[PDB]
Design a protein around this nucleic acid. Structure first.
Lengths: 104, 159, 176, 124
RNA sequence: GUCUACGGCCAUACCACCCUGAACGCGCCCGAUCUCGUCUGAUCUCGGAAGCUAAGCAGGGUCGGGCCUGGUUAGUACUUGGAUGGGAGACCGCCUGGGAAUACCGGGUGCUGUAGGCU
RNA sequence: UGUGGCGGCCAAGCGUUCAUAGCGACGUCGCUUUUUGAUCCUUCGAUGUCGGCUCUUCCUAUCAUUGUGAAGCAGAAUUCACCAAGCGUUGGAUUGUUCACCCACUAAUAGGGAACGUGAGCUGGGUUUAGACCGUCGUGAGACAGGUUAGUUUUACCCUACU
RNA sequence: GCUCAGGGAGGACAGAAACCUCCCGUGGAGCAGAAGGGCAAAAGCUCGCUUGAUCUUGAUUUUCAGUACGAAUACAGACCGU
RNA sequence: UCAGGAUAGCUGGCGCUCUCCGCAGUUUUAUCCGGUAAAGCGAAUGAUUAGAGGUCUUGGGGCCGAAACGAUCUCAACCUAUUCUCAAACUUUAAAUGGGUAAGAAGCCCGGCUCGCUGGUGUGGAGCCGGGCGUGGAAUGCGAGUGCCUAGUGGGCCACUUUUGGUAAGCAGAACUGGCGCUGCGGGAUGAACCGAACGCCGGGUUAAGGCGCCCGAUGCCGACGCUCAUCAGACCCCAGAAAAGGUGUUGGUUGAUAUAGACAGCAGGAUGGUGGCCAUGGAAGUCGGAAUCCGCUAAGGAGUGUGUAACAACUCACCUGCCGAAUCAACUAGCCCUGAAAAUGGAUGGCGCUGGAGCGUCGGGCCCAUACCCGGCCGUCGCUGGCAGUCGGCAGAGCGAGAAAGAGAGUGGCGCGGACGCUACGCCGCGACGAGUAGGAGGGCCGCUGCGGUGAGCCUUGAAGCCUAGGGCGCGGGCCCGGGUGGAG
RNA sequence: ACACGUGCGCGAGUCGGGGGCUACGAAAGCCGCCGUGGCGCAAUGAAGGUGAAGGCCGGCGCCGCCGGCCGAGGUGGGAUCC
């Protein structure tokens, strides 16, 4: 007995039922498959960050003077206009009281 | 069943164009690929070392690794069900800077200049892109002339 | 198209949206005998795409108003030029009808082409519709009514409204 | 209508019968078949305190504001159109001409420019 | 106006023949002691500066060939979608969008980077 | 529907003359399921599978008979075509044969279908179990789309059909 | 360092075909093999020197389940060639 | 290994992390990618007909050579400009549909540190700190994300378009999307796949696709305009039986002729002579033929229509009329009808029947009905991580749906003895959308059977189980409860 | 026997299941100097084996260390909380 050899008939329908989910993209991708001369050097640069720590925070505290230096030195109808003003209930808390007294 | 194999159905794909054979221009090697810039892949026949598989010819990925002669691309390849973002090592003759990002970065810089200028004045600049809106009313002037009448031509058996 | 009911003559003028190369593109006019404006403007783009290299998206419809009959109480002769598709090749015809309106004569033409030649609305193109004098007509079916002292009876007046009794005593009369 | 929506309309062309509505039709549809999408629930717009409580931020505080923002395609058309639950119209009273084919070739599919208002009467 | 050295795009720069090339250049040119290499100082390497634009090179010319670039061909061929459309079929027509390619007819015939001269 | 059968269309030629009385090359359009393929849809907890005898009915693609048109129809004989299936279409030698071929007769000895009609109707010559013989092949058991001989043919009393 | 296939024309015996010399020559040749692609101061031909056809981790591509084998691509650490 | 498994895919269940910025079987704007359809051969590779103009690089042939030069008509070969026709395994050009990527804070623009990498050079690259910038940077739609365990399945078939092998197949094998399988419903008379449209239990309305002589709901409209007669009429997707060819049938058209300079016919009078010119020359007195084809004479004389035909004396064929009086002729084209058209039981536009259609083509108005669409009733599921512990009562004050984030706020200064229901919270209540289903999966059973621990101060000789029943009812159902009879101990 | 979900008890633990003690009951109760033991709290290597965090501040722009103070990372997103 012979049989059908191959098809891809119901497969488009099958793929889309649970939907085609794109790869889980993030910030901070892994450094696997990066040049291991470049990678070992990048690891030494990370290891030797605390050696130049005193200049980092000292420059940041001198540059934080540069903020305080300059931040203190820094310092359609006329009727529908009126009725949209009167009707809304913090701007027009006294215009309604004037209206309310104006029945007498 | 088809014959498997790496260059099967790459006859016109990895060919060089008509009167564009021979020596490879050197600017190709002098363009500077950073880690991140978005790059479109196109295999070349002239250079047989470090080709992309025909799966990738015409796909755009991003660079995650630059070694002496080649760059690492991350290209979204589709299988049956799922899409795989996958990491290939392709020589820089088979590689170009995509101009898809050179239209966005001009937008951002112009978009930001239009907020450096006109933030203090109160004049509000519309930044976002509108699709071509329905056309405005206007007066089609018949400058003296009465429009020519077009009446369909009678049939004549040509050849 | 589909020649539903009595057609109406439309004056559909159109032009290409001005680009940079020409800010003043020339206006073109057409006579469309069609059921309404929405089909008149589609049949305008059919004929305009075939004569000129002008399209719907590459142009605008400047004016599409119904052309009225200037004498719908006078009996006129209408000589119409055709272009229809047979089941082997395409043919040009000249066809005379006798009516008060042009749009009536064009509906009368579509019925006659449908009846005699089995030619439908999508097949038939109309290129020229001219009202004629009584002396400039070559067809005997329309000329025979060019008789100032015309006289004929209504011979065999078949009884209509047959189902009004449905059960009568008498046989119906035919001679009137 | 923009550039984006017309090229979306012409690829579902044989399944829709669309056109340019009248002020009357816009009044009839939003007064007779007006339901809001309040808490994702299809609730009938019997009062103005539904529209005001939902679309208060865009200054659409009544039914006449809603009908104005729809008809004269304003700023907050998106948030007023997406507020309106899609209109559950009746069958056409008098029947169709022909469902399957285009309006131009006798049928009742594709763009019916000013003639959509007649179909709105028979289904509303 | 223009060359030289190194170039980028790689015929609007290529090919055929003709004409003109001021001044520095570039050359042809002159030799074989040392360097160096051949059957042969022709080529290659070297040491020269009497001559010459004849050639290379440059600029230009030709109802030139090619190349580039428009028009036409033509809303033609094909094509997305639609119909209880036509037809015995083979294939067609319409609606809704997209739209080429020869022959044939015009126009053009290198742009330019750094560095250094000549006028 | 390739193939088998049967029929048109065109007119190069045949026919003393003369395309078409009767025929018809090179081409070309069909029809039929009385041929053989091609396929695997139905049946493998079974549809009894070759022929003949017997007996009914149907088809027409008409052999004969009836009525007719046309011939290269003088008569006689013969050939082509039309309406046309009412009635006929036989007796034998050889073969299991279907088919074939011959003798004789005759108005004529036309072609077909009905689960390649018809086995609880027969028959059992042929195929196609088990016994044996020969030839070719196999080392052998055995094989043969070779020849040969001998080899169990069951049941109706049910429903319908018909009498 | 050269330039191929083929052609034109000349040159003792020498002719269709031995050898020399000039001109045209975009690949019409060659690259071991089938076919496709690719290549001209080369990937071809001829010379000189050699052993990267050597030792060693991981990554990746192709078939793909996104597994093995086979084959391959870019790196890194050595020792070497030119 | 091919009647089976493992393996991804499709399926279900359990949840969990979040939300009162993320995604997408789509489009728009940018930006790459391609070598099919088409086209091309006076562009490469290959196949391919045709004359030209040149000529030897060629041969021949004969032409006046004693022998060779020239030579001369040259023919194929050759070169050059042209020409007709092609390609799944050719191509300069080259679409439509299509396939990637981008459309921001995972971002920008500033400083400052680290490096054993890289270097003329705080040069190049990467990593690290502290900063400041929201107008959230296309349209439209929508709550997303993530992890466990997992059953069935692994014979498929059909259709529009594309498409391979075969003459073709209700044949064999593919791509794309849609169906049947797993699915009823209205139409196609009938039918797994067509067309319309997908279904909880009902009433009203209205539609689709199809219909409306009678069967058979609805044209019993004073429907419109033509076409067609069939001794085989014709009559609706898939679809259920036809072609070439043809018609002085009939209805349109197209092109070109003759028309009062008087047509298709109707019937005459005539068809003459050099000439028994010609070609081989049995024969061309015109007569298997072939080729020359004019004139002397004119209304016709044509070397011509058939002739016994070698011709012949001789009948007969275009011609102008003798009689006679305006509109005809000729070739294509395409509608309907007709010929072409032959099978076996009796026979099928579904039947009857229909011809001022009940046929065919083009179109009005009205009407008929689906489980589809609208309004409403009832059931269920799902969603609202919905509402209620305020039944806050002579110690009471009964309010919290309302467009706009917040206190029905609190102190010190300037007579009558009253008030429904509620809340098995595992309950009760409110609003919105939904409901096909085989294999398969899960939940809920106040569905049922038989036995054990508890419990009903259960039932029962004033009659238990069991059984029968035109009795009374409940439940969507599984089932159940009462009445009457029989029966005799649970 | 295994895996995963789910309910309960105790929790760096947990469990007497084999043993012993003093009608229903062959049940239930108890042991702790009855936890032997099982599974868990440590991995990796074939193996012999080895076996899970540090900077700074002085003395000996550096010590193998003498010492001294403090000490289970960082970035981004993150229900609630302040």
């Amino acid at each position: 007995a012979k049989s059908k050899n191959h098809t891809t008939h119901n497969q488009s329908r099958k793929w889309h039922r649970n939907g085609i989910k794109k790869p889980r993209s993030q910030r901070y991708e892994s450094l696997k498959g990066v040049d291991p001369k470049f990678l070992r050097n990048m690891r030494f640069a990370k290891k030797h960050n605390k050696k130049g720590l005193k200049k980092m925070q000292a420059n940041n505290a001198k540059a934080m003077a540069a903020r305080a230096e300059a931040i203190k030195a820094l310092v359609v109808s006329r009727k529908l206009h009126r009725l949209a003003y009167i009707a809304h209930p913090k701007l027009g808390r006294r215009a309604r009281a004037r209206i309310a007294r104006g029945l007498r | 069943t088809n014959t498997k194999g790496k260059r099967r159905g790459t006859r016109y794909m990895f060919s060089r164009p008509f009167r564009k054979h021979g020596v490879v221009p050197l600017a190709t090697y002098m363009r500077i690929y950073k880690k991140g810039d978005i790059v479109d892949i196109k295999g070349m026949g002239t250079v047989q070392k470090g080709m992309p598989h025909k799966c990738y010819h015409g796909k755009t990925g991003r660079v995650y690794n630059v070694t002496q002669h080649a760059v690492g691309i991350v290209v979204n390849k589709q299988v049956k069900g799922k899409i795989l973002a996958k990491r290939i090592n392709v020589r820089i003759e088979h590689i170009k800077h995509s101009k898809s990002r050179d239209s966005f970065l001009k937008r951002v810089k112009e978009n930001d200049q239009k907020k450096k200028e006109a933030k203090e004045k109160g004049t509000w600049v519309q930044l976002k892109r509108q699709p071509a809106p329905p056309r405005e009313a206007h007066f089609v002037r018949t400058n003296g002339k009465e429009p020519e009448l077009l009446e369909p031509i009678p049939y004549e058996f040509m050849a | 198209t589909k020649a539903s009911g009595t057609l109406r003559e439309y004056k559909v003028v159109g032009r290409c949206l001005p680009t940079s190369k020409s800010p003043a593109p020339p206006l073109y006019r057409m006579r469309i005998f069609a059921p309404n404006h929405v089909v008149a403007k589609s049949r305008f783009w059919y004929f305009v795409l075939e004569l000129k290299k002008m399209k719907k998206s590459s142009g605008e419809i400047v004016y599409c108003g119904q052309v009225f009959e200037k004498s719908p109480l006078r009996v006129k002769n209408f000589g119409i030029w055709l272009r229809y598709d047979s089941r082997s090749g395409t043919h040009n015809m000249y066809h005379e009808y006798r009516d008060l309106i042009m749009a009536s004569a064009v509906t009368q033409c579509y019925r006659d082409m449908g009846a005699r030649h089995r030619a439908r609305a999508h097949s038939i193109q109309v290129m020229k519709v001219e009202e004629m004098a009584a002396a400039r007509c070559p067809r005997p079916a329309v000329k025979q009514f060019h008789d100032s002292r015309i006289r004929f009876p209504l011979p065999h007046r078949v009884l209509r409204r047959q189902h009004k009794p449905r059960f009568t005593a008498k046989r119906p009369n035919t001679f009137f | 209508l923009n550039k984006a929506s017309i090229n979306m309309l012409r690829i579902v062309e044989p399944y829709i019968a669309w056109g340019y509505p009248n002020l009357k039709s816009v009044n009839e549809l939003i007064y007779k078949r007006g339901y809001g999408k309040i808490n994702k629930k299809r609730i009938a717009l019997t009062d103005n305190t539904l529209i005001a409580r939902s679309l208060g931020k865009y200054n659409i505080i009544c039914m006449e504001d809603l009908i104005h923002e729809i008809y004269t395609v304003g700023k907050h058309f998106k948030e007023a159109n997406n507020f309106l639950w899609p209109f559950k119209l009746s069958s056409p009273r008098g029947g169709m001409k022909k469902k399957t084919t285009h309006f131009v070739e006798g049928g009742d599919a594709g763009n019916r420019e000013d003639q959509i208002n007649r179909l709105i009467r028979r289904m509303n």
